[PDB]
Symmetry: D2
Subunit: 261 residues, 4 copies
């Protein structure tokens, strides 16, 4: 069907893309980057994340594939030398689809803006100290003082979440995980410290205490938000779909990326 291919833009990826386009020319495949049904990403995880956000308005109509021209990536988990066998099976179709949960972030002002995350959404201060009240399903849980907070998808747990001490969870779990960045804990200031894993339909709301300017990042994209009244986190109703052509279990991908490959 309709398909498009993004490239990291180096010599290796551009050339692989042109060779795959030539392979797709031999089948009933039409190149369309407006309404594709298959999005292939050649590069790294950033390149894949860029591709997801390019088509986040059509997630239910697209199956993603990532090719890693550098090291093994978590989302780009197929090798460049296997690009031909990829072109073949993708042209025949009859593949299976694999869905991962996504994360919704809502920012209210004094207006509303929402964002979809594949890895995580983080919050930091514009420059001053970062103080925010953390409210869970309208229950005030803590007042966080520190550098910032990170709300991660399941597949994102191996990313920024991992460096902050968070747990790695399997993407079949529809959940989201909040981790701390350098919280200050003493006699007066008290946070939980432990990461928190929230189920679907739970709402985690951050509410300012003094300064209302916050550096909010969604994957690679970071934006300064002024006069913030509330940041809301919840597991999205939408999901990203992966075209799978063979078994590459999550824990196997985790073993190869962190233990030994």
């Amino acid at each position: 069907m309709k398909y498009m291919i993004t490239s990291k833009g180096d010599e290796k990826s551009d050339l692989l893309r042109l060779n795959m386009i030539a392979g797709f020319g031999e089948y009933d495949m039409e190149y369309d980057d407006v309404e594709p049904e298959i999005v292939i990403s050649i590069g790294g995880d950033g390149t894949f994340l860029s591709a997801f956000h390019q088509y986040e308005e059509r997630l239910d109509e697209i199956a993603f594939i990532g090719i890693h021209t550098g090291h093994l990536g978590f989302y780009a988990d197929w090798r460049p030398a296997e690009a031909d066998k990829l072109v073949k099976l993708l042209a025949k179709g009859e593949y299976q689809k694999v869905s991962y949960p996504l994360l919704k972030t809502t920012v209210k002002y004094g207006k509303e803006a929402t964002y979809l995350a594949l890895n995580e959404s983080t919050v930091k201060s514009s420059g001053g100290p970062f103080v925010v009240d953390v409210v869970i399903n309208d229950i005030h849980f803590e007042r966080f003082r520190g550098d910032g907070l990170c709300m991660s998808t399941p597949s994102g747990t191996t990313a920024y979440n991992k460096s902050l001490g968070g747990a790695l969870m399997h993407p079949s779990i529809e959940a989201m995980q909040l981790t701390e960045m350098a919280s200050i804990n003493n006699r007066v200031y008290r946070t939980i410290g432990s990461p928190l894993v929230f189920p679907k339909h739970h709402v985690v709301s951050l509410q300012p205490v003094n300064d209302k300017d916050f550096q909010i990042s969604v994957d690679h994209l970071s934006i300064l938000h002024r006069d913030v009244q509330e940041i809301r986190y919840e597991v999205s109703a939408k999901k990203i779909h992966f075209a799978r052509f063979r078994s590459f279990p999550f824990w196997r991908r985790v073993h190869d990326s962190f233990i030994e490959d």
Copy 2:
């Protein structure tokens, strides 16, 4: 219906139990510790854990309640001065039931023994170094060298799991979480370090490397197991049921126990 009450055995709990039995005498309540339908625990979380294991053969036929005569416990989350209003509503019935996932541990020899955990199951060595191969759904993930491992239920994440850096997850998530104890990591020895959260139907299997003697604990109960061939972890098909009479949200219980009450 039929009910029984366990006591920590101090003066405070024994007396509260006798006073509740007297209150139940005023209703159509029969004391039966053989086949109760309501199990009340007066004491601490250990007292509650002891009560769960006393009736783990009838979990589907029992709703548990815990009264804390000392500090607030996670499972014993109702106060002694509220014991009368508890007796009333329990006698009328028409309460709601709240299920938490449990953890199944299977130990094979060279025979098989299984155990149900409400908090966690841990593994340590008999005395020598602790080396074990960690296999996830028949995929070899790592070779753990360290002090031991902890596999925790959701409700157990606030217990031993919390002191080992694990995440706290909400008990509506049917999952289990593995955390490390003092793993040795260098150029030759490599573990993941991060906690791992596993969904239902996933099997985590520990397999010995040299010594086959292991100190295996299930909640408060610890047993030396000799000639161990395999320890298997998976989320149980069985669940513990709590009789709830009002909203005491998990994150509220977490706030009170760790932040401030």
Copy 3:
């Protein structure tokens, strides 16, 4: 002798300062904020840190004292109600002096700028990723990829260093401690993770890999440094001196601030 007093600038501290000045008027004490020999700070640890940097050019000629009008601070460890007994003993003199090690940071360009730290010096990126080579006594130790790094004095170990997992060390140890902020560790990227404690006369040098812009902070003061060629850390030859009038042991101060007071 000559003395001055800084104030946090709220009603409480300003009034305490005016009352202490009146008490000093009754003795052979001359107020001089140009060349004082005693610097008193009324407020918090920030107020004390501001006072240290106001006179970092005369550290060998000044003994510091801090009064905490809010909670107990580590540097401001004397209470407002004890201000009179402080005025008395300070006027008589014959006190003991207590020295804490300081931290020297040197920034080279393509020129040189140096800074003295009482708590810590940190490095972060201007906006892009933070990659820096860490060289210890001209030996290349690692290539750090992460959010940033923190080099802490002994007395600073209870401050930012504490929130980053660093050890708390006693200020009689002439040393400095480096801790990580959210390092990325995988098959390709490898840092030590553990905090590092360096003795006197050791030089730790950070060297850029790509981007040469870095947000460098020294205590409360943060400055964007462009075209950075090198950041050098070493234990200063200079020391801050505290006027002590009674035993307030470091570990006692640590107990009161973090365990219970």
Copy 4:
């Protein structure tokens, strides 16, 4: 002068030892394992630790050397193929000596026993819960509830201390570092969590709360101590001396063992 050589006892180490003895036969070297002046250890760090404890009664009269027949060890940091050049220079003498601080542990009963540690001394309970009061220079600092505690030498910081989150410190620092094992922290139970680094002449004393039986380990050696009244930790007046024949800086050894070699 007088010398002896210990062996791990495998084929590789035994044969290297016999070949070095033959090399020493060609010089004015007499084999004496009663009063040696040079102790060579062929094997791993355990083999080296065993050798240190074999002659802990003559530390001031002995310079140690370790050869690693397996992977690089921290104490055994010279390779088997370099054994000949080692024999030569050792026979000529005129080497430099390098001292590392040691750790003294004193156990009182209701009698006294002391031990010297090269890596660390740890405390765990005999079987029940581990509760101990931690007193620093006669000041009560905390009541530790958890799995156990670890008091480490500087050179030991890369060993068990490293797996418990402790900092790695350079052995020219005469100090000792205490780290926690799975402390329980909640509203009622409070420990510092952070590692603590203590200078020379500081005394850290552990004092029982209920059960007085403790599993105390000093390096590889673990002993059950009954009716314990006090465990005291302080930096030893004694030091281990290493015969050095070239520069192998501590941080270089750390880089090779943990980053890449």
